Amino acid sequence: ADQLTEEQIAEFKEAFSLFDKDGDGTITTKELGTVMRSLGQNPTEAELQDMINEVDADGNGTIDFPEFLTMMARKMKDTDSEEEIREAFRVFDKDGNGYISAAELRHVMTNLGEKLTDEEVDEMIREADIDGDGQVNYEEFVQMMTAK
């Protein structure tokens, strides 16, 4: 649906060089996810290794702008809507009251697929629970998180 703009490609080009490192006009695969998140994209780790596995077959663990730009255009075609994130949360909400305990949120995030580190979860709960009462409002948290 969404197709790259002429302006958009310029944005992606400038931000891509920051990680250019050596200056080959190349980036490291292990550095791949970071540059996408910096561009507003929310790729999953499994999605990341699929991109790696395609362009890394030559080894060298590197990927250039053209093939990066390809990975960015594909990821932009299907991106979770705010409504899908809220509905995903809603599944871990048993009351249906739109609240989850920080304790329970921490438990699921760390114990369910693509697990966050304890340090990561700490940071998540910090801006997710604003009043620090141990309860997080996820519909409010999702807005802030998907906010443009």
Partner: protein, 696 residues
Amino acid sequence: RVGVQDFVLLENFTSEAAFIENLRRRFRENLIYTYIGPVLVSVNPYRDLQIYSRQHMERYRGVSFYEVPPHLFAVADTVYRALRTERRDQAVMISGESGAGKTEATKRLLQFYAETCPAPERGGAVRDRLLQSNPVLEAFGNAKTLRNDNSSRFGKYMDVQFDFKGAPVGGHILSYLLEKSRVVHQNHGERNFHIFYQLLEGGEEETLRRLGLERNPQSYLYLVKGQCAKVSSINDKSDWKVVRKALTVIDFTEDEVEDLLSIVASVLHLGNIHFAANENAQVTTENQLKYLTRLLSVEGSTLREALTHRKIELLSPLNLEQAAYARDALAKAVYSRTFTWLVGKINRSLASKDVESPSWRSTTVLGLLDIYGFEVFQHNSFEQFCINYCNEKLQQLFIELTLKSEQEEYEAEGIAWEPVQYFNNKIICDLVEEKFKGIISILDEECLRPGEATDLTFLEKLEDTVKHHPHFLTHKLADRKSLGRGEFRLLHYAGEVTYSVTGFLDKNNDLLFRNLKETMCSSKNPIMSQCFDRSKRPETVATQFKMSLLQLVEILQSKEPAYVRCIKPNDAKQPGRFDEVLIRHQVKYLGLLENLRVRRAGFAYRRKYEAFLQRYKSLCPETWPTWAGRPQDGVAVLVRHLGYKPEEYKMGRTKIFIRFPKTLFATEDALEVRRQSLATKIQAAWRGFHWRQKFL
């Protein structure tokens, strides 16, 4: 490998003769557990065969129930799994006659949860407390009757509370109407509460000396009014060692145990007091009255005249009949109020310690119902009337859930259903608790004012108000004797029981004279000052009890039920003995065959479209994240994507019906894996959002 593990699979399923045969065949091979649908039927082995060890537990935990043989642990793991997937209060309802195995059944369930479920983190071990509560309650609440060597004289409903991780965080117990008279009286062959005998046989030298107690039970009139001080199936010295150890587990301090023992010894001493004469009644021996002041911590003089006098405005003396009656009233009050205290003290121990969150709004309870079962003796009085009425009210709830409700639902729905006929005991329940017109309501009417209505005047208004009723009979109807005078026959779901009306008014009004009440308020004993305080609105025992059961029912209706049906093999408490006449009678009034019919033709699961859709919608792309149409339509496309065969489900008016449990489990196991993906969506969204914040 014997018979059929599930009656639904039984061929010739309409034969009552085939039913009992399967029970008999499995029983002698020592298979005591058998399924009717989700309902588990249990036959008392009356011997110890260990299916309850930790090896057995491991094979039932985390597995589907249709994939493993029938066992009590299955229902345990099924109920615990129900409590996990969907977060809803669950309750295991257990029915049976006296000695059917309800109490042992509840203890086994707990054991499974205690050794099976995961441990909390900062949570404590309430697991040991939940288990150790039984020995303590059995000592004080259980006594040997002719029906059961270990018999619960109190009803029990217990809640276990789980956190969101599935580990026990604590629990709560509710008790119902301890049998009071048992403390001052026993019919021949029966003992008093276990606690008394445990103390005498197991108590240490120094402790019994301090309580002024003799090791020989025959030396206490309250202990042996049944000529029975001993039971071959019971080692009182061992039970005592256990109870003493359990009290520490449930956090009784050594001082509280010495105080409780003081109260226990006082009742023993209390029964040994003899009254002689003046012209009117006074205490001959100083021995009991002595220890009595010390252990009860009251003034020896105020107690003596409290036993020998009555406040009317001066004090008139009493006679040997009245002086002995007041004594018993005190002993009953002291033990009963002490029992109530004991339960609260335990509840104080099981109660989780937390302030608020996280979360504690996410905790769900697992209820376990253990009550006193239907019992009938040669002589039946107020105590049996309460107990048998209790089983009626709960027998109604069983019917309401397993027969009435499920069938009325099909009708309201679009489901094709051929009605199955069942007996409804609702009529019997009304005979008792009906307003104004009811036995309990009448007994209350006669309880207004003293010196006016008697046991015999009560039965009279009973005959007059209840006229030619199917479940009520007296000597004034048809041919009886066998039906005597001063007694009424009531036909329960479990069969007819004859009651004497003598003692009914006195037992319904639970009356302790201000004289004796004041004396107890002056007690320096910590436990006693908690049970007795200060000094209008005197509600009757029967009406208060009626209130309790109503609350108990509405508590159970609000939970997702599991059913265990206990069956007694014989009247002799004998292993390997299968009595066909007895088992038949039970199968008949329990309505097990009428149940087998409903299960064979019925559906294991039903849910409203909206509820079914909100839950499983992530399993289909057309229903995810949202569905804009009618819920039925969403469930329609959703179940097609899920691959339900047309025979596996039925679309009703307001709900979807799924015939077999295997269908829903496979679905719940899919939602289990889908959660992995949904979590990844949140984690990916957070990982993206977080980087953009701490940078840029």
